[PDB]
């Protein structure tokens, strides 16, 4: 569950690397890697905060490109682009907006894990020599070891 | 630990 049962104020979590947004009283979950960036604007007493998500045309400069999260999962799927809201009635939008920027480190970790999925072709299963003796040496050093 | 060369590696002395 969330930090509180009521969600009048926007609360953001960092352990799960994800956020929950009430879309006019309806909560929906979003990922930090699914969100691109955010910005704020102030005009007089009005405050408008926009959060742009990661999608085709926003995460990538050229549309219909190759993206590991959006396009490699489904290259022809509907995606959300951005959302906008107003937090002018309360001086607590900065504390919630700091957690979205703190989630960018987890988004970069998710991107590093996605780039760690490359070179999928690996070694096959190895059967040990059970046919009697095995040939060995002593006093052997190995250079690319992590020792 | 790295062994860049078998013959010897850098002394790591500061540049005057």
């Amino acid at each position: 569950l969330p930090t509180n049962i009521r969600d009048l104020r926007i609360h953001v979590d960092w352990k799960s690397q994800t956020i929950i947004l009430p879309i006019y009283g309806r909560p929906v979950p979003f990922h930090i890697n699914s969100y691109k960036n955010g910005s704020k604007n102030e005009e007089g007493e009005y405050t408008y905060l926009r959060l742009n998500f990661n999608s085709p045309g926003s995460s990538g400069g050229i549309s219909k490109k190759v993206e590991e999260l959006p396009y490699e999962e489904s290259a022809d799927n509907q995606f959300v682009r951005s959302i906008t809201l107003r937090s002018k009635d309360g001086d607590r939008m900065s504390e919630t907006f700091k957690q979205i920027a703190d989630l960018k480190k987890e988004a970069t970790k998710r991107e590093q894990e996605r780039k760690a999925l490359a070179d999928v072709v690996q070694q096959d299963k190895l059967i040990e020599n059970k046919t009697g003796r095995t040939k060995r040496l002593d006093q052997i050093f190995v250079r690319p070891n992590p020792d | 630990p790295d062994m860049i060369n078998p013959e010897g590696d850098d002394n790591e002395v500061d540049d005057v």
Binding site: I23, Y24, E43, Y48, S58, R81, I83 | -
Partner: protein
Amino acid sequence: STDFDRIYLNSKFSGRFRIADSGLGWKIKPFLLPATELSTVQWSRGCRGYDLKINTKNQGVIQLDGFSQDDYNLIKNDFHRRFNIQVEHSLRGWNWGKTDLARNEMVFALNGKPTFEIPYARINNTNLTSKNEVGIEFNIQDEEYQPAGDELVEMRFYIIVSFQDVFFTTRGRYDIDIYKNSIRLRGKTYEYKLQHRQIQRIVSLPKADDIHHLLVLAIEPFLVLQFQKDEETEVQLNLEDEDYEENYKDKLKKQYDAKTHIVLSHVLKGLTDRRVIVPGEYKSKYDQCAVSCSFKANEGYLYPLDNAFFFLPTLYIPFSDVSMVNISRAGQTSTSSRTFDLEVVLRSNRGSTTFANISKEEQQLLEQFLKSKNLRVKN
């Protein structure tokens, strides 16, 4: 039945509910939900506001909130007698999804898991682009600072009197309209709502060359609007001939032809119902109305008035608020060309402001104005 005064419904405050055998009565304007109109129950603890989430066939979703965790054994106890319906969204949080246009909602189904269902009652405007980008702009009915809470403005997805061409500095070109008790600023940047009670003061000043006028509206910091001297066009109000006399307290007629900046200032004075501050009659060097000076590595115009000095960030130094003033000058051959400085210190906010680059004639005019105003000049 049960009665509770802490039931929250609809960007607003809480309301009241009444259970009955014939239906449900929700009072904020009483509303009746019949038992034959409910279709499904989506009450679950996976989302915030753990209460019943009922679906109705009357183009609305009963998203009632403000119920305890022990009410699920109680309210469903009222459901097994007649409805006999057991209450069982999306938790993946991935960007992948599918948009489906329902009869009155927009289903966001992320591989069989619906996430969003927005009714069309709260929708205000929709826009589309050539790249199949859909943007829905809404207007949440904010009533007070406490009861509004967080509110949404725009959602994007990928698949009386009004004015036009108005240049503002607090910077760009947009449009402004006057509502019955509010003002809406619309443009390519953003949409803003301004209250008449939030507006405090309105002033109009000229430039040094008298080619443009600056209208400063201080609302509690100050919005500055620059207008040309050739703006002489007539405006009209879309209102009744008898209702406008009561609305504006007969201050101005429905049709009037004058300067547009003067008409806007008169409309602001009529709406605010406060006295305006006219520019002073004091003349600077070469018949100027203001003095140019450097502050925060920016050139700005400082002009005195009857009770305050306005420097155009835009600052206002009151005569009563400023505790003391002082003048500093050095001895050199270049002392006659913008070398003297004037520093004013105020103990109300504990702040000192120093304006440098003042010539001999400008300092003499400032000293004459201070001697006329009998201000405390420290030496």
